[PDB]
UniProtKB/Swiss-Prot annotation, chain A:
Catalytic activity: angiotensin II + H2O = angiotensin-(1-7) + L-phenylalanine; angiotensin I + H2O = angiotensin-(1-9) + L-leucine; bradykinin(1-8) + H2O = bradykinin(1-7) + L-phenylalanine; neurotensin + H2O = neurotensin-(1-12) + L-leucine
Protein role: Essential counter-regulatory carboxypeptidase of the renin-angiotensin hormone system that is a critical regulator of blood volume, systemic vascular resistance, and thus cardiovascular homeostasis. Converts angiotensin I to angiotensin 1-9, a nine-amino acid peptide with anti-hypertrophic effects in cardiomyocytes, and angiotensin II to angiotensin 1-7, which then acts as a beneficial vasodilator and anti-proliferation agent, counterbalancing the actions of the vasoconstrictor angiotensin II.
Protein name as it appears in the record: Angiotensin-converting enzyme 2
Organism: Bos taurus
Residues that bind Zn(2+): H355, H359, E383
UniProtKB/Swiss-Prot annotation, chain C:
Portion of the full sequence shown: 463 to 560 of 1273
Outcome recorded upon mutating F27S: In strain: Lambda/C.37, Omicron/BQ.1.1, Omicron/XBB.1.5, Omicron/EG.5.1
Function: Attaches the virion to the cell membrane by interacting with host receptor, initiating the infection. The major receptor is host ACE2. When S2/S2' has been cleaved, binding to the receptor triggers direct fusion at the cell membrane. When S2/S2' has not been cleaved, binding to the receptor results in internalization of the virus by endocytosis using host TFRC and GRM2 and leading to fusion of the virion membrane with the host endosomal membrane. Alternatively, may use NRP1/NRP2 and integrin as entry receptors.
Annotated effect of mutating F27L: Increased resistance to neutralizing antibodies and human covalescent sera neutralization
Stated name of the protein: Spike protein S1
Ranges where the record places region Receptor-binding motif: 1-45
Oligomer and partners: Binds to host ACE2. RBD also interacts with the N-linked glycan on 'Asn-90' of ACE2. Cleavage of S generates a polybasic C-terminal sequence on S1 that binds to host Neuropilin-1 (NRP1) and Neuropilin-2 (NRP2) receptors. Interacts with host integrin alpha-5/beta-1 (ITGA5:ITGB1) and with ACE2 in complex with integrin alpha-5/beta-1 (ITGA5:ITGB1). May interact via cytoplasmic c-terminus with M protein. May interact (via N-terminus) with host bilirubin and biliverdin, thereby preventing antibody binding to the SARS-CoV-2 spike NTD via an allosteric mechanism.
Amino acid sequence: STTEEQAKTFLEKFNHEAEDLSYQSSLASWNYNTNITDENVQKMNEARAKWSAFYEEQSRMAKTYSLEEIQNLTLKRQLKALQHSGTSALSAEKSKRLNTILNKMSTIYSTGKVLDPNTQECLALEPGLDDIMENSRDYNRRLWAWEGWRAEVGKQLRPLYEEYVVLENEMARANNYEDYGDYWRGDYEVTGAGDYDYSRDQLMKDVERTFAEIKPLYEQLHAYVRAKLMHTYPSYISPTGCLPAHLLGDMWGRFWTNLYSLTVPFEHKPSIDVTEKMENQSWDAERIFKEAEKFFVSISLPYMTQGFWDNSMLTEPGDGRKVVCHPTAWDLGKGDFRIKMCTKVTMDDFLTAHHEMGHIQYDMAYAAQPYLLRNGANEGFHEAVGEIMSLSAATPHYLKALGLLAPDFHEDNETEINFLLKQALTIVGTLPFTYMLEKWRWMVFKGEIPKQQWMEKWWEMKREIVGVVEPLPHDETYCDPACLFHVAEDYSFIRYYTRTIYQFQFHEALCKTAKHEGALFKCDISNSTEAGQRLLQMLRLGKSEPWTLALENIVGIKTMDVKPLLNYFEPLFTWLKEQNRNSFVGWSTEWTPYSD
Amino acid sequence: TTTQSYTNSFTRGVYYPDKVFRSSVLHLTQDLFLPFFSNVTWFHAIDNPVLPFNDGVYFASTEKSNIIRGWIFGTTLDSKTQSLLIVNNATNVFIKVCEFQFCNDGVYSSANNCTFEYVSQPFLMDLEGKQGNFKNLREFVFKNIDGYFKIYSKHTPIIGRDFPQGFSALEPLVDLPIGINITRFQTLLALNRADYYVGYLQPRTFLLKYNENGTITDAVDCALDPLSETKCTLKSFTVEKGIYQTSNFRVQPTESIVRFPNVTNLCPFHEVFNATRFASVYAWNRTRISNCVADYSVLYNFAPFFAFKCYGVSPTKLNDLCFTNVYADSFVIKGNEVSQIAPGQTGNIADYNYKLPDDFTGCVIAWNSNKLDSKHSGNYDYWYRLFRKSKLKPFERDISTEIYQAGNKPCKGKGPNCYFPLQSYGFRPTYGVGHQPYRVVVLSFELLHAPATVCGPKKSTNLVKNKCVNFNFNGLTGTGVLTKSNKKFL
Amino acid sequence: PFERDISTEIYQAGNKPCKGKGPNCYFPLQSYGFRPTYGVGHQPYRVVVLSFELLHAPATVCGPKKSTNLVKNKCVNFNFNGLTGTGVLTKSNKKFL
């Protein structure tokens, strides 16, 4: 009778059939992570093609249902997740040209090669380039490589970006949305709840206030970084002015992990290096996994299934059957999880193991939910919880409790500052750039700007906001910030920004409620049943309900919190305040290194 | 610390069984009395050992100063159960009958629950008399009568002679009305601001001689000695010369044996738990039981039996319990549906395919079958049903439900807003716990008027030889001796 | 008779010492759910028993208090604490405790 019952029945049928097909396709994807054989990949592509066909067919059947006559909140969320059609809303010709341009993007990004003045060296994409960047500090070499890559990629990409903005605002109209930025923000759409509804511009207001409260601290840290660079290059940095774009620290302006040898305050004393300790103890990957499970039991998370240790790959089975080992572990459906590592006995491998363990635990938590909401409430929850697991593992207090570190060890202020600086500069260098590109995509897809006010405003804004000056001026036909793998197939950086802020908030709330004393950093969250239940009561929810109620349960406030950025680097900032008296404050936009 | 001396009580510990006056009567009564010349273990405490309260522990004391109080009675006298106290002080009774954990002596650690309390007068009756060694003779009788805890008393002074051969009459006192259990007993000596005779009273008939004033001057046992038994039978304290037929002697049965036929019915209970080609939930199987064997070991040892919960009949007191027909239905589900199997509860499978009624008596058993009813690349043989009009009636089959309809619009086949209720049930050997194929059988109990021929092993016991035993040959109950015969039985 | 065995201890099935609920380890007590939805055989009947001891003891409860002045050396019917009977009541020189 009522459309709600028809929607429910369909939803049940779709959930069952799609969970079966998704289990098949996830088995195919896991065998893709494992094998690379031609028969395997033929099975995998046929499985994913049939899954896509089934999803499109079910969407076509479900297009009949209306939108107003739904009153259940879970049913409303299911309808919102279901009604997303994407490229199916357009015509066959539009779909074919879209998939052809996606294939062109993939091919050019995979086969992009830049030639140095000597043609005998072919810089093969990111591999090799990243190694040269990390192990060499040659201004001419790195600047020329980046300049050539930009002058090629952006020159090819300029008209296709305009094609993309036109097509994507057309998709937004097909979804009855104002723009593609709002289309992305539809993942943060809350409707039908009193004192609980938040629209898309609320996120814009939140990012504006976060920028307002981080401007001085970001200015201070950028000034310290540029002072460190000046101490190694005295005639290449304007201290009173901003820092050039080719001096952010890495090849894309994304990471700041390269600024580690010349940025550590006390390089003489060694950092926390337990790798020698597990080399002494002769640790194994299986025992590291068991220790991770023991830690998760200490945080009261449910035990891993026996199939998890039975079926899942843990160590490399020879070299003839090569395996890719990017850090990722998704469920297969119906309660099956697996993991893939290029594991060794070091610290970073254990860190990513804990990250994917948090990923798998979050994936298991919502397993009682149906398929359409079988995901995080956003696009970065799993990454954020993996990061908070990794940080919980990173604290030396956890090492002391586990016994891998000798008990006769004394914590030192300089060592704390070094660890905090490393674990900060590894993530926070990406924070200015992720919204620096996300806001620009937002505004370009808004339609509020003309065509010939893009590169100049790009550079001027990044200088006046963070201190990123263009060393080599370029006209409006370039796409220098669009030479990344993430933007190759139109992937939003909203996920990265929300991961960075949400993981912070999670760990700060956990340490606050873990009866900790002293500095919030260097504190583990383990052997705490109360905090473990605090995790679980929102882990079991997932996409079923918006993040705001789980946020008010975890921390106590309803909107996004700005405290974690300030209170996570407090020792570094307090130590920098006294040293700020001898370091100039501020940057000048008009100053560029090539204006002589 | 305390000693462990052993002595003889002689004649002592005689109380008034009733509250009726008897004058110059030789009335004979049988109750919990102290056997005459029965050895009583006497502890000299200067400690506080444990003593099992079995059949009316009796107490006495011949001290020189007030050191002993605190009578406690309960099962293990600790561990959160009701253990009570009869601790006293020389103002009032100071009854402390409540539920405690530790008291050591009012004086207690945990309040917990509590019950009857009563204070009227010093229960120990602390009077010094004239001499210093008045001994405050603590004769009391504590016993359990249908939950009515009885207490007697007699403060008859003695002079030096402990456990004296002089007679005494224990007058009754107040009694505890607490309907609790008692297993052990300890004397919780009081805290500072020749004392123990535990004469357990086994049941035995007693002949009591009353004075003209109603006092019990003398008594004689009825089973202590042949002369005592003769006096008991004659109902007099004097017996003339001659032979007296007192009672009869029999050899008590040393053991009891139960015999029954070969119990060979051989129900295919193992065969119904291993028929590989099972039936899905949409069409659950059903079997009829008659002249079977109720071997519940397979239900108990075979298979991990992940599900064992049931609410109607205890699965422990079931081997001997015997019916005629049992409705057992077999089907395969995942982990969570096994838990959802219950009487009067929600759940898609339990609401649309098989509903357990509220008045369902029986036990639902499910175990783990991860490799039998599953295979790689897909197990599509198993089916299930998902849609119907409303809640399914208990014990209902809805096979061939055609095609489910919705939207109040005519439909012809599997298409728009009209789908086939038989949705795929994909089974793979790589499901984690919650989705692993779980095999469940629901077998129901019915109190059947039909002859119950499935009653279990019947407890066949070996039958000794040449020994007086209680036999149960094929239901022939009786007592006697058994020996090999030379009969010519047809 | 007249016994209370209040205890929540796991009643094992078979011989294993299992504790908890589920496989061959059972809780001593199960649900007593009461709803207006069952039949007369499962309706929540609230019953109370009354137990008395009609024995030769000083009666504490006596019902409707009716007392007639006691007479002596005369043929009368006595109802002392329910001791119905007939006879001549004369004061005695016994040693009643």
